[PDB]
Amino acid sequence: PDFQSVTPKEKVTITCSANGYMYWYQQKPDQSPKLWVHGTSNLASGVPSRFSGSGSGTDFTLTINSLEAEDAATYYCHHWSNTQWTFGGGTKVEIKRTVAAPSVFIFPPSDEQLKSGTASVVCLLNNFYPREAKVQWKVDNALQSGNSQESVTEQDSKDSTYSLSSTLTLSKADYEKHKVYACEVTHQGLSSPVTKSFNRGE
Amino acid sequence: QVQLVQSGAEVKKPGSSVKVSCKASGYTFTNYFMNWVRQAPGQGLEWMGRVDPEQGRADYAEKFKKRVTITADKSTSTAYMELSSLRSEDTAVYYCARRAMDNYGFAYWGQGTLVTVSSASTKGPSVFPLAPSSKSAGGTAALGCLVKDYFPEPVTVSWNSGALTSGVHTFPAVLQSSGLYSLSSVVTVPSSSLGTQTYICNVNHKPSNTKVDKKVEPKA
Amino acid sequence: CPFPALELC
């Protein structure tokens, strides 16, 4: 699934390569796909005229002139080949805005959780843009790898930002062996990395 | 008034089968193929196959030539897709789709049927505070709830019984190695409110009938 | 059927 950032009112062209007629779909999360273009260049019903389909040779395109907020979606091409239908990989179109730095927060495991033998340590990166960010966990200044999982929100409707959570999972025994827990964040909007930390038990 | 209405979501164990239905209305059922399309979580659309309701004949995509049986019942205007010997990688939304009147594109789609395939058993979450830091203010503090170790999806999280919506982010669930889900929900609030205002995350896991109201406070 | 629509089969 390709990812494309577009400033509102700018133009984007999505290419689908293939060996008669190309079809295109728009899909938003938790919705069924909508037919968008048919017969390579014919707009489907209700589709804004700022969209246009074209093709030549093996290269088929969907162009969005003067992108609007409502055009943020995944787009798919679709064609008949041999004895079956084939959909292309999607292209997810997001809204480009000014760079915004994350606000970073760290949370220690609760006493409630620790009483049953696991410690989740949580790092929150709030309301940033673009989506690309790097989280580094350090435990008594040893870099960690392989014991964290992260999740990212969809783009905010109002400010076009993202948020991200990273969870470090340790056993209680391992958690109790160390003092300093630190989340170091790198992002285009941060001139140098930001570190948030706590001392176990403080 | 072309409509395609599918059967509801199914949570399945590996080795089982599921038969998804698609009830058609608003056109002559035998006039068109009924197509089936798969979409795995966060992944692309994939054409699986189709059935000719007039003659009963089906066609299957190369990738779906095993374990997929697509049929149609003329008398109830219903198409079916049976998926056998299920595997975790069969987890997906399945759609039925009909072409446009005047072109071969898929204009009409069902609402989708979520099929989740897992060896996990129903299990309610534990809810833990993400307590606001004592170093807050700046002026803004973050707090939240960690909703850990549940199956299946979903959980709902509200704050202060729905009164607090501003600044809330409820993250997508992550699948853990255990086969259970975990999710965090966070909110940013004024630092000045922390000594005064009560913050409660309201967590519901209907599949296990689990309802938790967890108060989140500064740690002392 | 090797065609994209039933009316061609």
Do A91 and A107 belong to one domain? no
How many residues belong to chain B? 220
Do A74 and A162 belong to one domain? no
CATH classification at residue A31: 2.60.40.10
Q: Is A87 on the interface with C (CB under 8 A)?
A: no
Q: Which two tokens stand for residue A75?
A: 């787009």
Do A66 and A147 belong to one domain? no
Asked if B3-117 and B126-215 have one fold, the answer is: yes
In whole angstroms, what separates CA B169 from the centre of its chain?
A: 18
Structural domain of residue A119, as residue ranges? 103-199
Where does a domain end: A71, A95, A119?
A: A95
Q: Residue B44: which of A34, A45, A87 has the nearest Cβ?
A: A87
Q: Do B146 and A78 touch (CB under 8 A)?
A: no
What is residue A174's three-state secondary structure?
helix
CB-CB contact of B158 with B144 (8 Å): no
Do A57 and A16 belong to one domain? yes
Resolution (A): 1.8
Q: Residue A33: which of B43, B45, B174 has the nearest Cβ?
A: B45
What are the angstrom distances between the C-alpha of A78 and each of A55, A90, A178, A182?
Answer: 13, 10, 54, 47
Q: Residue B104: which of C1, C5, C9 has the nearest Cβ?
A: C5
Q: What is the dihedral of CA A147, A151, B129, A148, to 10 degrees?
A: 10
C3 chain-A contacts, CB cut-off 8 A: 80
Q: In B, residues 40-69, which contact C (CB 8 Å cutoff)?
A: 52, 54, 57, 59
Neighbours of chain A (3+ CB pairs under 8 A): B, C
Do A8 and A64 belong to one domain? yes
Nearest residue to A166 (alpha-carbon basis) of A183, A149, A143 = A149
Do A121 and A180 belong to one domain? yes
Do A64 and A127 belong to one domain? no
Q: Is the peptide bond before A29 cis (omega within 30 degrees of 0)?
A: no
Do A135 and A187 belong to one domain? yes
Type and span of the H or E element at A167: strand A162-171
Q: State how far residue A33 is from chain C, nearest Cα, in angstroms.
A: 19
Nearest-CA residue of chain B relative to A119? B128
For testing contact with chain C, the best of A80, A82, A86 (most C CBs within 10 A): A80
Q: What is the dihedral of CA A82, A88, A89, A92, to 10 degrees?
A: -170
Q: Which residues precede chain breaks (C–N over 2.5 Å) in chain B? A: 137
Pairing of strands B140-150, B126-130: antiparallel
Residue B193 phi, psi dihedral angles, 5° rounding: -80, -15
Residue A108 phi, psi dihedral angles, 5° rounding: -70, 160
Nearest-CA residue of chain C relative to A80? C4
Task: Quote the number of domains for chain A.
Answer: 2
Q: Do B186 and A165 touch (CB under 8 A)?
A: yes
C9 chain-B contacts, CB cut-off 8 A: 52
Q: What is the rounded distance in angstroms from the CA atom of residue A175 to the CA atom of residue A155?
A: 34
Q: What is the rounded distance in angstroms from the CA atom of residue A91 to the CA atom of residue A114?
A: 43
Nearest-CA residue of chain A relative to C1? A83
Provide the residue type at B93 as one letter. Answer: V
Q: Do B52 and C6 touch (CB under 8 A)?
A: yes
How many residues belong to chain C? 9
CATH 2.60.40.10 for the B126-215 domain, yes or no: yes
Type and span of the H or E element at A21: none
Q: Do A85 and C4 touch (CB under 8 A)?
A: yes
What are the angstrom distances between the C-alpha of B135 and each of A87, A105, B22, B139, B142?
Answer: 52, 11, 56, 11, 11
Neighbours of B191 (CB within 10 A): 16
Do A107 and A90 belong to one domain? no
For testing contact with chain A, the best of B57, B59, B130 (most A CBs within 10 A): B130
For testing contact with chain B, the best of C6, C7, C9 (most B CBs within 10 A): C6
Do A10 and A68 belong to one domain? yes
What is the residue whose two structure tokens read 């594109």? B105
Where does a domain end: A45, A63, A95?
A: A95
Q: State how far residue A23 is from chain B, nearest Cα, in angstroms.
A: 6
Name which CATH class applies to B3-117: mainly beta
Beta-bridge partners for B216: none
Do A52 and A108 belong to one domain? no
Domain borders along chain B are: 3-117, 126-215
Q: Is A83 on the interface with C (CB under 8 A)?
A: yes
B104 chain-C contacts, CB cut-off 8 A: 4-5
B52 chain-C contacts, CB cut-off 8 A: 1, 6, 9
Q: Do B54 and C6 touch (CB under 8 A)?
A: yes
Do A107 and A34 belong to one domain? no
Q: Do C6 and B57 touch (CB under 8 A)?
A: no
Q: Do C1 and B52 touch (CB under 8 A)?
A: yes
Please indicate the experimental technique that yielded this structure: X-ray
Where does a domain end: A39, A60, A95?
A: A95
3-state SS, one letter per residue, for chain B: CCEEEECCCEEECCCCCEEEEEEEECCCHHHCCEEEEEECCCCCEEEEEEECCCCCCEEECHHHCCCEEEEEEHHHCEEEEEECCCCHHHCEEEEEEECCCCCCCCCEECCCEEEEECCCCCECCEEEEECCCCCCCCCEEEEEEEEEEEECCCCEEEEHHHCECCCEEECCCEECCCCCEEEEEEEEEEHHHCCCCCCEEEEEEHHHCEEEEEECCCCC
